[PDB]
Design an enzyme around this catalytic site. Structure first.
Site, mmCIF file in Angstrom:
data_model
loop_
_atom_site.group_PDB
_atom_site.id
_atom_site.type_symbol
_atom_site.label_atom_id
_atom_site.label_comp_id
_atom_site.label_asym_id
_atom_site.label_seq_id
_atom_site.Cartn_x
_atom_site.Cartn_y
_atom_site.Cartn_z
ATOM 1 N N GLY A 218 0.806 -1.199 0.000
ATOM 2 C CA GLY A 218 0.000 0.000 0.000
ATOM 3 C C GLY A 218 0.846 1.257 0.000
ATOM 4 N N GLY A 220 0.776 5.600 -1.946
ATOM 5 C CA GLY A 220 0.483 6.360 -3.140
ATOM 6 C C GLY A 220 -0.984 6.645 -3.332
ATOM 7 N N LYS A 222 -3.472 4.591 -2.635
ATOM 8 C CA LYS A 222 -4.215 3.341 -2.702
ATOM 9 C C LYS A 222 -3.673 2.364 -1.667
ATOM 10 C CE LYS A 222 -1.315 1.339 -6.322
ATOM 11 N NZ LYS A 222 -1.272 0.835 -7.710
ATOM 12 N N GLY A 223 -4.497 1.379 -1.329
ATOM 13 C CA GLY A 223 -4.098 0.338 -0.410
ATOM 14 C C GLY A 223 -4.164 0.717 1.050
ATOM 15 N N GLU A 340 9.838 3.488 13.937
ATOM 16 C CA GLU A 340 10.666 2.916 12.887
ATOM 17 C C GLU A 340 12.083 3.453 12.982
ATOM 18 O OE1 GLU A 340 10.747 5.658 9.758
ATOM 19 O OE2 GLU A 340 8.698 5.136 9.150
ATOM 20 N N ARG A 344 19.750 5.773 7.458
ATOM 21 C CA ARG A 344 20.498 6.725 6.658
ATOM 22 C C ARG A 344 20.457 8.077 7.338
ATOM 23 N NH1 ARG A 344 15.198 8.579 3.258
ATOM 24 N NH2 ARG A 344 14.702 9.350 5.360
#
Lengths: 640, 533
Positions: A218, A220, A222-223, A340, A344
């Protein structure tokens, strides 16, 4: 004060590393490239007395070249690459390897661009003897998607989690390295993912009403489905199962409206990992950072130190090197939740530099050469040890020594358009003048000549301000933002940032991750001049253009031997302008080359107007002077 | 006037100026137009910050700007050790310490490029403007070679500058050549790549000097006007001389009468001295020709020649010697295309490299490994948005092709790749799963279309396409004189004059092109007496 280095080889020898780096490839562009080169070159001068001891290679698309991207001129060498989307130029790991071997470089820096989220790049580079300035792929794998992240966080000092599928965990591995083998945690994955229509409900019964259901692919638009009810869960749940057919779906509890904190973690290749300091990043628009603040002043000392300890334990057990960020969700009652780990360096990393007196990209370089933490100068000073020495640091015993110096605000300047939403805009620059001052600085990825093209992301500059406390930093930032000048075809969100910093909710630090969303729906795009002044100024700009064009065309005709009649060289212009639905009709004439008269409805006002060499006008209206600029669009006049 | 003012601030460094990028400094405007400040914990850190910051700023304008001297002072050990007094700088001034100059060879090359680029762009602009107005100029006013002369520290350097492409420049001195990659920047400067290292450079033309900025260092070249030789400013004819041969003339006095344009123009002396005439009354005049020498008292600038006779640096080459073989294809082919478009080296250099370009292309096009390398690049660049089924099949097929290299039955599986892609398209997912597939597979389609008949057909196709380029230009300049053909082209291409210019420019180098044509015929229809339709 007896160190005598001239080349990276000697430095590596003296400081106990194992890899010499003389050439670095930057697989990035824009701000990241600028910042990397600048910080490291400063460090290079400091150690070698040569600002160009480490050479930097950059990959240049035709778009960035035509747009006169700032990093191009700074680089030592450039190589052209194919243009277009990121997958042809910068997110192509195999291309990065191809360049890194074609041009013999010893390292590759990726930063926060497009390749640092691809765990395959460290493998490709390490197989060819190239040092990546970042984590190994095994960490990035163990730090894979979201289920594995939530699971692995619970193997050492367990941070609270809002039911990442469930609250179930695996066995204890406090300081041991482990891979995400699907033998023990498979059960958790089976609970973390759902197959049937009624599997997700088993989470809803425990987490409560605010349920967020998302597909494994999911994103963008959607999802993703947000369930606010209890009985409507099956509808949106089955919808998500149809958004990405065939893929496993997961259900998690939605966050409350609270604060978003971060911890900056730094680590060497010898198992030493330290927490630098934190950040408060709770000014977000549609989950996009806008303003960041360095001292995490909302969290009390006890709980914040706990969050630091948890972040470090995670970094140690998973096997993370160089630098990264751990995100936490801080609730108002003194309770944090794990979100999370970002593997980086972040764009907002100067916030912790400015209060720690460190240099992170240079630290990444020194780590990549195999230098442990107790031999890097700035770290040694941070823990109260003489920089010129080799004694080890007991990081656990002296973890109370580091202390932030001051308070920093970082405001990012985006290219969106606050008028009619936040649509990204693009075009050419006409002026970029950032007036720095004491305790204020900033930098941009574009110069006065040049522009922003279609594939050139937003966030074209960053401003930073330091103060002794919160209030002073705010003051510095506000003044500096009010003093800068950005003019071009694109729109430039700055005035909105000013309006936010002047808002009492911000200044009293009474904000959350949904603050700006609520303010957007309340239609807060203020910071407009008074109407009467704006009407007058727009009238003057329109009339002056018309008059100058008349003069130019008439004089050109005279040069060619044509005579036009004496009514095409007019001294009066009719101007019409609509503001907020109201139409204003004015006449503009002149009593002298510099004295203009604006007439509306039988009333007249006199203005002293002078033409500036930069295209703008200097006005004197009612005593007060003003500097003004106009841009004519297809159906609008933009008056600054 | 100011052209650019960019002070890159940083942590613990700031500064401010009384003038912006637009604006300037006038007569009554004092010196000290800006101040930089740097903070540190101690002396050394502050010095380091200041030095770096000063090396990073950019000030460009008509005036001169003392910054580099400050850098040199801050890097002097006497300063850093704090062993200075109020007479330090005066002593250093008398010792002639104005250092911080770039290396001579680089400066020579950069100045040559700037001069030549201005000359070339002016030629293009004036020629194109003439074409727009309906005038046709001959094809020797649109030159691709410029002669540049530059004096540095008394030494004269004479160079030729030409181009092998719009971006590839070649600098030639004393029979030695160097290649430079040049890109035009929107801000008026040039981006160079010279010997690996890249450089950002700017030039300002003065009355008798060229000011060349390389990075943050400045180098000044003198424009020769010293020999005190009177020269004709234009073409034309000499009618008579006004004064006696051997008589003294004063500056501003007319010494000669010439006529160009059927309109008489006199000639004033520049310097006061004794004039002796070279040309006899009644003579053809060329611009810049030698008309009359004058003896002066030689205040200075005596024998500022000592013409450099050596060779310029030549380490790199960018020839891709053994690099991947499919990048070499693009390299040599693009060089040959640019030859066909009129970009050609001079006499002893042309056909010294072109023959090699042809040979390398012929070897590359007969290597069976070329098309799979192309496939590798185009397939790897697009990992996502490709259905896994077709991805796996393609990888398998190209692996099989690799396994069969060096076999008489080895053929590139273009049809099989096309088959699996058309199978997925025969399934034909609808609604954004249609277009994504047809678009993200276009590179593969192009590759397979090029190699429908194998490497043989592709080879023939490439060489044929070059021959077609030749005919595309040279069939337009048959049937009469130059100007008539140009007018035909002008009347066909009404809405674009750059096309016309391109035809003319490439036609100018017809002989060199013909050499290439013959070499490409002999490598295609040589020891194989057969001709397809």
């Amino acid at each position: 004060r007896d160190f005598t280095v001239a080349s990276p080889a000697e430095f590596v020898t003296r400081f106990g590393g194992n890899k010499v780096i003389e050439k670095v490839l930057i697989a990035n562009n824009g701000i990241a490239a600028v910042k990397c080169m600048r910080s490291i070159r400063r460090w290079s001068y400091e150690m070698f007395r040569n600002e160009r001891a480490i050479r930097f290679v950059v990959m240049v698309t035709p778009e960035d070249l035509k747009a006169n991207a700032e990093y191009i001129k700074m680089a030592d060498h450039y190589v052209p690459v194919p243009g277009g989307p990121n997958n042809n130029n910068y997110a192509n790991v195999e291309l990065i390897l191809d360049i890194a071997k074609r041009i013999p470089v010893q390292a590759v820096w990726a930063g926060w661009g497009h390749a640092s989220e691809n765990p395959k790049l460290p493998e490709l580079l390490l197989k060819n003897g190239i040092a990546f300035m970042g984590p190994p792929s095994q960490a990035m794998w163990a730090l894979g998607d979201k289920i594995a992240s939530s699971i692995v966080a619970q193997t050492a000092g367990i941070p609270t989690l809002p039911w990442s599928g469930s609250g179930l965990r695996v066995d204890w591995q406090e300081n041991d390295f482990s891979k995400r083998i699907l033998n023990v945690p498979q059960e958790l994955y089976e609970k973390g993912y759902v197959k049937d229509v009624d599997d997700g409900l088993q989470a809803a019964e425990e987490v409560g009403y605010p349920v967020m259901i998302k597909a494994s692919e999911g994103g963008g638009g959607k999802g993703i489905r947000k369930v606010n009810n209890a009985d409507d869960f099956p509808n949106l749940f089955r919808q998500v199962q149809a958004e990405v057919p065939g893929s496993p779906i997961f259900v998690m509890r939605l966050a409350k409206q609270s604060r978003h904190l971060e911890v900056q973690i730094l680590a060497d290749q010898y198992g030493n990992a330290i927490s630098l300091f934190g950040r408060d990043c709770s000014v977000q628009r549609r989950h996009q950072k806008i303003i960041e603040e360095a001292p995490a002043t909302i969290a009390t000392p006890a709980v914040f130190e706990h969050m630091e300890q948890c972040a470090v334990k995670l970094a140690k057990m998973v096997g993370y090197v160089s630098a990264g960020t751990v995100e936490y969700l801080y609730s108002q009652d003194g309770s944090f939740y794990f979100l999370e780990l970002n593997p980086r360096l972040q764009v907002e990393h100067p916030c912790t530099e400015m209060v720690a007196d460190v240099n992170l990209p240079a630290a990444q370089l020194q780590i990549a050469m195999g230098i442990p933490l107790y031999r890097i100068k700035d770290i040694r000073m941070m823990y109260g040890v003489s920089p010129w020495g080799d004694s080890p640091i007991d990081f656990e015993d002296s973890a109370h020594v580091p202390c932030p110096r001051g308070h920093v605000i970082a405001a990012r300047i985006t290219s969106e358009n606050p008028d009619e939403g936040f649509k990204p805009s693009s075009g050419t620059v006409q002026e970029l003048n950032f007036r720095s001052n004491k305790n204020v600085w900033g930098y941009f990825s574009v110069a006065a000549a040049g522009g922003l093209h279609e594939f050139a992301d937003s966030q074209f500059g960053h401003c930073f301000s330091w103060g002794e406390n919160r209030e002073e930093a705010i003051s510095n930032m506000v003044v500096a933002l009010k003093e800068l000048s950005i003019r071009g075809d694109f729109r430039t969100t700055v005035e909105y940032l000013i309006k936010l910093l002047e808002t009492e909710s911000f200044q009293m630090n009474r904000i959350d991750t949904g603050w700006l969303d609520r303010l957007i729906a309340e239609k807060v795009q203020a910071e407009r001049p008074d109407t009467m002044l704006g009407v007058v100024c727009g009238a003057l700009h329109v009339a002056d253009v018309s008059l100058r064009n008349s003069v130019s065309n008439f004089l050109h005709s005279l040069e060619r031997g044509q005579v036009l009649p004496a009514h095409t060289l007019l001294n009066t212009v009719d101007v019409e302008l609509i503001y907020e639905g109201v139409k204003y009709v004015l006449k503009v004439t002149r009593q002298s080359p510099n004295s203009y008269v604006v007439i509306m409805n039988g009333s007249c006002v006199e203005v002293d107007v002078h033409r500036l060499s930069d295209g703008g006008l200097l006005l004197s209206y009612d005593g007060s002077s003003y500097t003004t600029y106009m841009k004519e669009e297809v159906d609008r006049y933009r008056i600054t | 006037t100011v052209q650019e003012l960019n002070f890159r601030s940083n942590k613990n460094v700031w500064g401010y100026f009384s003038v912006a990028a637009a604006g300037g400094l006038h007569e009554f405007a004092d010196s000290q137009f800006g101040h930089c400040f740097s903070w540190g914990e101690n002396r050394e850190e502050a010095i380091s910050n200041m030095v770096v910051a000063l090396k990073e700023l950019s000030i460009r304008g008509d005036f001169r700007t003392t910054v580099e001297y400050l850098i040199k002072l801050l890097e002097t050990e006497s300063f850093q050790m704090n062993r200075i007094d109020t007479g330090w700088l005066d002593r250093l001034i008398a010792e002639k310490v104005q250092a911080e100059r770039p290396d001579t060879m680089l400066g020579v090359v950069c100045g040559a490029l700037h001069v030549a680029d201005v000359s070339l762009r002016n030629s293009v602009s004036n020629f194109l403007h003439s074409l727009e107005r309906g005038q046709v100029l001959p094809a020797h006013t649109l030159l691709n070679t410029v002669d540049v002369e530059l004096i540095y520290e008394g030494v004269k350097y004479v160079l030729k500058v030409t181009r092998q492409s719009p971006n590839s420049y070649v600098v030639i001195m004393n029979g030695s050549c160097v290649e430079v990659d040049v890109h035009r920047l929107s801000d008026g400067g040039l981006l160079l790549s010279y010997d690996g290292s890249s450089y950002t450079t700017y030039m300002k033309e003065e009355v008798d000097r060229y000011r060349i900025t390389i990075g943050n260092k400045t180098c000044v070249f003198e424009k020769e006007n010293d020999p005190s030789v009177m020269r004709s400013p234009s073409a034309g004819k000499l009618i008579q001389y006004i004064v006696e041969d051997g008589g003294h003339v004063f500056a501003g006095q007319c010494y000669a009468e010439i006529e160009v344009m059927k309109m008489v123009m006199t000639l004033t002396a520049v310097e006061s001295g004794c004039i002796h005439y070279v040309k006899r009354p009644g003579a053809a005049l060329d611009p810049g020709c030698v008309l009359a020498k004058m003896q002066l008292d030689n205040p200075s600038k005596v024998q500022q020649a000592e013409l450099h006779t050596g060779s310029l640096p030549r380490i790199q080459s960018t020839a891709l010697r053994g690099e991947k073989l499919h990048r070499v294809f693009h390299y040599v082919l693009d060089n040959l295309v640019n030859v066909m478009n009129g970009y050609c080296l001079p006499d002893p250099f042309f056909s010294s490299k072109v023959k090699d370009w042809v040979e390398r292309l012929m070897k590359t096009l007969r290597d069976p490994s070329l098309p799979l390398l192309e496939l590798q690049d185009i397939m790897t660049s697009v990992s996502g948005r490709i259905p896994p089924n077709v991805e796996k099949s393609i990888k398998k097929e190209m692996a099989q092709y690799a396994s069969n290299i060096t076999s008489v039955l080895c053929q590139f599986p273009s049809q099989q790749i096309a088959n699996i892609l058309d199978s997925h398209a025969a399934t034909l997912n609808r609604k954004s799963e249609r277009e994504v597939f047809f678009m993200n597979t276009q590179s593969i389609v192009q590759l397979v279309q090029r190699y429908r008949s194998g490497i043989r057909g592709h080879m023939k196709a490439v060489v044929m396409d070059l021959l077609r380029q030749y005919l595309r230009v040279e069939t337009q300049f048959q049937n009469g004189h130059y100007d008539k053909c140009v007018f035909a082209l002008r009347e066909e291409n009404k809405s674009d004059m750059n096309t016309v210019l391109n035809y003319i420019f490439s036609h100018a180098q017809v002989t060199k092109k013909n050499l290439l044509v013959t070499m490409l015929i002999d490598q295609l229809c040589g020891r194989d007496p057969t001709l397809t339709d």
